Amino acid sequence: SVSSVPTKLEVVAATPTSLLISWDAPAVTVVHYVITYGETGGNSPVQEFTVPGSKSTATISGLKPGVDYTITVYTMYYSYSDLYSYSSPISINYRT
Amino acid sequence: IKSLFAVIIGGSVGCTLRWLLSTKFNSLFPNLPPGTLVVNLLAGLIIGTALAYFLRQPHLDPFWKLMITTGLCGGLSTISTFSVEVFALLQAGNYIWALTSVLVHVIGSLIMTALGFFIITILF
Ligand SMILES: CCCCCCCCCCO[C@@H]1O[C@H](CO)[C@@H](O[C@H]2O[C@H](CO)[C@@H](O)[C@H](O)[C@H]2O)[C@H](O)[C@H]1O
Ligand SMILES: CCCCCCCCCCO[C@@H]1O[C@H](CO)[C@@H](O[C@H]2O[C@H](CO)[C@@H](O)[C@H](O)[C@H]2O)[C@H](O)[C@H]1O
Ligand SMILES: CCCCCCCCCCO[C@@H]1O[C@H](CO)[C@@H](O[C@H]2O[C@H](CO)[C@@H](O)[C@H](O)[C@H]2O)[C@H](O)[C@H]1O
Ligand SMILES: [F-]
Ligand code: NA
């Protein structure tokens, strides 16, 4: 019944080489969030890093100016039936 | 073998009740899952009432006592689910609710055992 996927993923601030993103926590115990990013043109490596479960913002650095990026966030979360598992991702596109 | 059936019947009912209450209600308040809490508090309450009640009639059938305590209360309560809940909160950086969960489960369940015992003892 309860979704484990974050909502309202968006870019709240941007420079040509960086993005500050944020999201609303899902109503579950999130142990950590995993942020992924890569160039939308599907010819570049996707990178990932984690943020603690208490944080609902993240900075993405070292980007190229004028380039479309696909950014996703999913959770590693605790629930009763599944103990620790990974949620589906929420995904946005953003052009530096 | 008769004792084994008491454990299995009581245990299966307790385990089933815990499964139903936990799956139905735990997700309502994830910082202190209420299904896991209620079954620990309830098991504490039942063992307390059993403690007082069985003292008064010591030669009653060992079958009923075994079904209720080792079986029902034992199947109903859980330290394992309680532990992962707390462990997950600790890994999530949620120290206030990890501490709160430990205090409410442990102090709460001991209080319920006392209440069960003293309610029956007061009821004469
Ligand atoms: C987790 C448990 C918590 C306790 C909650 C209270 C529930 C009690 C319901 C059953 O009540 C008992 O019924 C027995 C059967 O009718 C009675 O035994 C009476 O009859 C027996 C014979 O049937 C005799 O052996 C006994 O000495 C005699 O007291 C006994 O007094 C009475 O209390
Ligand atoms: C908590 C939930 C409610 C559960 C209630 C269960 C109701 C049924 C209990 C009946 O149990 C009997 O109690 C007798 C006495 O109470 C015992 O008699 C035994 O003990 C007596 C007392 O010492 C002697 O007089 C008898 O001869 C001797 O057979 C008898 O063995 C036992 O089977
Ligand atoms: C008295 C009862 C004793 C029972 C034993 C309990 C054992 C505790 C296990 C805690 O696990 C660690 O918790 C850290 C804190 O939540 C996590 O750090 C995470 O969060 C930190 C702060 O939010 C960051 O600095 C870290 O980089 C980040 O990995 C870390 O991953 C995790 O392995
Ligand atoms: F817990
Ligand atoms: Na148990």
Author numbering:
A (entry chain D): 1 to 96
B (entry chain A): 2 to 125
Which lines from the publication concern this structure?
Bacterial Fluc channels assemble as dimers of small subunits (120–130 residues, 4 transmembrane helices) arranged in antiparallel transmembrane topology. The hourglass-shaped channel is complexed with two 'monobody' crystallization chaperones, which plug each of the wide vestibules facing the two aqueous solutions.
Mutation of the conserved Phe-box residues in a Fluc homologue from B. pertussis was previously shown to severely inhibit F− transport, an effect presumed to reflect the replacement of F−-friendly binding sites in the conduction pathways with kinetic barriers to ion movement. This idea is now tested in Ec2, where we here examine occupancy of the F−-binding sites by solving crystal structures of Phe-box mutants F80I and F83I and assessing their transport function. Substitution of each aromatic side chain by Ile specifically extinguishes the corresponding pair of F− densities, one in each pore, while leaving the other pair Phe-coordinated and unperturbed. The mutations cause only local structural disturbances such as alternate rotamers at nearby sidechains Ser84 and Ser110 (Cα rmsd 0.4 Å, 0.2 Å for F80I, F83I). Functionally, the mutations are dramatic, reducing F− flux in reconstituted liposomes to undetectable levels, a >104-fold rate inhibition compared to the wildtype (WT) channel. Moreover, the F80I / F80I and F83I / F83I double mutants with identical Phe substitutions in both domains - mimics of the mutant homodimers above - are likewise inactive. However, the Phe-mutant crystal structures here, while validating F− coordination by the aromatic rings, refute the idea of a mutually stabilizing quartet, since the two Phe side chains remaining in each Ile substitution, though distant from each other, adopt identical orientations and crystallographic order as in the full Phe-box of WT (side chain rmsd 0.2 Å upon backbone alignment). The results also highlight the importance of the conserved Phe-box residues in crafting coordination spheres for which F− ions are willing to shed their extensive aqueous hydration shells and enter the water-depleted confines of the ion-conduction pathway.
